[PDB]
Design a protein around this ligand. Structure first.
Ligand code: NI
Length: 341
């Protein structure tokens, strides 16, 4: 059944709750972003109002064939009325089209649902600064102090420098990047830019990227693999067998592959700096795991919450085990006692 952390009290609303059938009492289904664990259940047969960003609504229409009459896109950073309730969509610094949702309940309670987010100090100057938030529905993916990672900028600098050096040493090397969802487009676009190439990909992935409102995108991507020296493949194909196989397909145009796997966190992060990352190599194939995250680190999450000073926190991630729930509640209390709210 629909869990309580997906329901907004005092409303008829749910968030990211499309896989439970008709939720009793739901008059509007909000969708924070287009990732499968969140949209699970939507299709062309859905006949309830879906509220989301413009970009998410482009993907619902083009990839899932949801009918236009049920898609309700909202502009960001704008006070809107939905079934008699004031709401605002804010940028979540996650994947393209991802939002946080502010609900202003008729009784005067204010609720923030972060969806999936990477907390940033820039959020402290959005419409969030203007009033008090009483309850926080929080993306707790990486809510433990072991989870450190570098900035997105540091990671992209490493990837660009690595790729440019490799291809300049060997003009016959191919660069491959893995993907299994939207998000993390900066990895493959920054590398293609430094090399003066478009990124080549499947027709299905090209279609997905053309929904994202990225500026000048027609200049950066292509379905012609032959004209491209940065290829995108499914994340599943980023291993020695899959890459050897792909190289055969390129017909002796290339004699070396340098491949990137943008993981979330990996336990090389506790010890190893970004400067010191090394690849796994077999023969003429090398694979780099890079820690490019679109979720908050522990310290980023803690800074946002200590800034916001919510009265009550409701985790939306890692809620399935008692040990995880108890650990998270301990951190929340630490943060509250340290900051004095
Ligand atoms: Ni997500």
């Amino acid at each position: 059944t629909c869990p309580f952390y997906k329901k907004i009290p005092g409303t008829g609303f749910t968030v990211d709750a499309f896989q439970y059938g008709v939720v009793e009492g739901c008059t509007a289904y909000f969708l924070t972003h287009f990732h499968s664990d969140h949209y699970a259940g939507l299709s062309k047969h859905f006949t309830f109002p879906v509220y989301c960003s413009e970009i998410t609504g482009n993907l619902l229409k083009n990839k899932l064939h949801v009918q236009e009459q049920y898609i309700h896109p909202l502009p960001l950073d704008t006070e809107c009325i939905v079934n008699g309730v004031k709401v605002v969509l804010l940028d979540a610094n996650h994947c393209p089209g991802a939002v946080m949702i502010l609900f202003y309940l008729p009784n005067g309670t204010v609720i923030l649902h972060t969806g999936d987010f990477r907390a940033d100090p820039s959020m402290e100057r959005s419409l969030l600064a203007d009033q008090k938030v009483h309850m926080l529905y929080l993306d707790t993916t990486y809510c433990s102090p072991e989870y450190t990672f570098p900035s997105q900028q540091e990671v992209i600098r490493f990837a660009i420098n690595t790729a440019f050096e490799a291809v300049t040493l060997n003009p016959h090397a191919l660069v491959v990047c893995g993907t299994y969802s939207i998000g993390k487009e900066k990895v493959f676009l920054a590398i293609a830019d430094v090399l003066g190439s478009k990124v080549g990909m499947s027709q299905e992935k090209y279609k997905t990227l053309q929904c994202l409102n990225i500026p000048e995108i027609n200049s950066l991507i292509t379905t012609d693999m032959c004209s491209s020296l940065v290829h995108l493949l499914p994340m599943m194909q980023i291993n020695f067998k899959g890459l050897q196989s792909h190289l055969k397909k390129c017909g002796g145009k290339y004699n070396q592959i340098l491949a990137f796997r943008p993981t979330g966190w990996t336990h090389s992060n506790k010890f190893t700096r970004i400067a010191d990352v090394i690849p796994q190599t077999k023969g003429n194939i090398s694979i780099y795991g890079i820690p490019y995250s679109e979720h908050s680190s522990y310290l980023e999450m803690k800074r946002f919450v200590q800034w916001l000073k919510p009265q009550k926190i409701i985790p939306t991630v890692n809620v399935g085990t008692w040990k995880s729930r108890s650990t998270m509640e301990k951190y929340f209390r630490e943060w509250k006692l340290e900051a004095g709210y």
